[PDB]
From Swiss-Prot, chain A:
Subunit-level organization: Interacts with the viral nucleoprotein.
Domain of life (superkingdom): Viruses
Domain remark from Swiss-Prot or TrEMBL: The N-terminus contains the endonuclease activity (endoN). The central region contains the RdRp activity. The C-terminus contains the cap-binding region.
Residues represented out of the complete protein: 269 to 365 of 2151
Gene: L
Miscellaneous comment text of the record: Classified as His(+) endonuclease since it has a histidine upstream of the active site that coordinates the first cation.
Task performed by this protein: RNA-dependent RNA polymerase, which is responsible for the replication and transcription of the viral RNA genome using antigenomic RNA as an intermediate. During transcription, synthesizes subgenomic RNAs and assures their capping by a cap-snatching mechanism, which involves the endonuclease activity cleaving the host capped pre-mRNAs. These short capped RNAs are then used as primers for viral transcription. Cleaves ssRNA substrates but not DNA. Seems to downregulate the expression of its own and heterologous mRNAs through its endonuclease activity.
Coiled-coil intervals: none
Subcellular location: Host cytoplasm, Host perinuclear region
Recorded family membership: Belongs to the Bunyavirales RNA polymerase family.
Name assigned to this protein: RNA-directed RNA polymerase L
Length: 97, 48
């Protein structure tokens, strides 16, 4: 009875909403085992991910930005990619990275 | 082109293969529209 009465009071006090807001801060999915990511695997996976993104057709502004950034990543020069994954000790300033 | 961009060329023919796939993936939307359009609707562009 106390729970039901307080439910009624709570519904009276606040305006109702029909859109349950997000809680999962990082949405993700796995099907297989996960190997900890290294720099070489990071480069390989970024290449494959941009290839996968370039196939889809965006529908929303966030998706459009997603596609644009994947395109920009795939359109980076070899020196830019080398400096992108290089430590600051060997890092040198380039036009994009 | 997405599949080709993943591989690493080893021979000059493979290098040209990769370069042409890259050039195809780097074509503007108007260029792609005119690329697949009939000559009746085709209009001259910068690349196609």
């Amino acid at each position: 009875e106390c729970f039901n009465s307080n439910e009624a009071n709570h519904c009276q006090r606040y305006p109702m909403s029909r859109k349950p807001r997000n809680f999962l801060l990082i949405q993700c999915s796995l099907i297989t085992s996960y190997k900890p990511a290294t720099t070489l695997s990071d480069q390989i996976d970024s290449r494959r991910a941009c290839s996968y993104i370039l196939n889809l057709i965006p529908d929303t502004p966030a998706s459009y930005l997603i596609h644009d950034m994947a395109y920009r990543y795939i359109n980076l020069t070899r020196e830019d990619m080398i400096n992108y994954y290089a430590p600051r000790i060997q890092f040198k300033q380039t036009q994009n990275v």
